[PDB]
Design a protein around this ligand. Sequence first.
Ligand SMILES: O=C(O)CNC(=O)C(=O)O
Ligand SMILES: [Mg+2]
Ligand code: NI
Ligand SMILES: [Zn+2]
Length: 331
Amino acid sequence: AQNPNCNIMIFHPTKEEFNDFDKYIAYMESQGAHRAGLAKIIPPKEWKARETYDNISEILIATPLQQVASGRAGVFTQYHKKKKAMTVGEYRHLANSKKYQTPPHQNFEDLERKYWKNRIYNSPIYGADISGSLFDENTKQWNLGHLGTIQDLLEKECGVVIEGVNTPYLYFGMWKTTFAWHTEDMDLYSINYLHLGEPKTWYVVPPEHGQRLERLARELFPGSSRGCGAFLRHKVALISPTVLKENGIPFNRITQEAGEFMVTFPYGYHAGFNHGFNCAEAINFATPRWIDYGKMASQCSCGEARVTFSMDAFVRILQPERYDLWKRGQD
Ligand SMILES: O=C(O)CNC(=O)C(=O)O
Ligand SMILES: [Mg+2]
Ligand code: NI
Ligand SMILES: [Zn+2]
């Protein structure tokens, strides 16, 4: 078995190997990359997502989210308080202000220490889940707005034609902005490109060990657990690497820098934070190996997790028994 210790793998495709996205994902899995739950892909040096980022300031962040923490430094939840719209220019200025900017630090490790020590005492503002793309339409390779759709994958593998569309989302981050512990909707893959700015640190649990994370989470967030049998779908819970080590949960960590892709694999729980002002683009996708994970994915039916139009069809076709109760949650 390749990669038996489930380490995060880093790939350096050639321009030639960067032509066929599906085939490269399949290559990565042949080498065991999925075992980690997360891989890094460094694009060939000839590749570019677009010519420059000089003209992005007029993008609107219609609902910036202030991420308010509760709990203790290593075990907390966050809630998203909606703030007034601002442009990316305004947001960048805010991220760079004395109140919100990244503190002086030695290196990534020192900054990680500072994050876990101090995150709870601040409420950074995140521009998340903004429909859109920063890839130039002329970028032919690994353009997250030109991937094959999940609906087409399901049609190709299973023969059923369904409604729904699949488009990318932009994330504008600042110091301490945080993504809670989650897998993707319907345990899909995701791909994330860091277009610009400061890094993003990721933590990940191997898919084969995801249930160990869930068991810990139920112990650490006991009222949330009683409220919903899939409360990590709410995307609000954080657990530090110290806490995970104390409880024997297998995980890995890696820092993504501007110009790099990360791929999360089905049922790979991940969480992380941004180091300073940045912009990422991400999208879910499927492969044939995903199907069985989609069939088995947990669902939130308490009604908090409230998810896309397109997830309806996935649940309807892959989880017909759940369909009924899940849609009661969605309506
Ligand atoms: O970048 C972020 O804030 C969150 N991204 C993801 O969880 C992802 O790409 O799967
Ligand atoms: Mg603009
Ligand atoms: Ni994710
Ligand atoms: Zn729920």
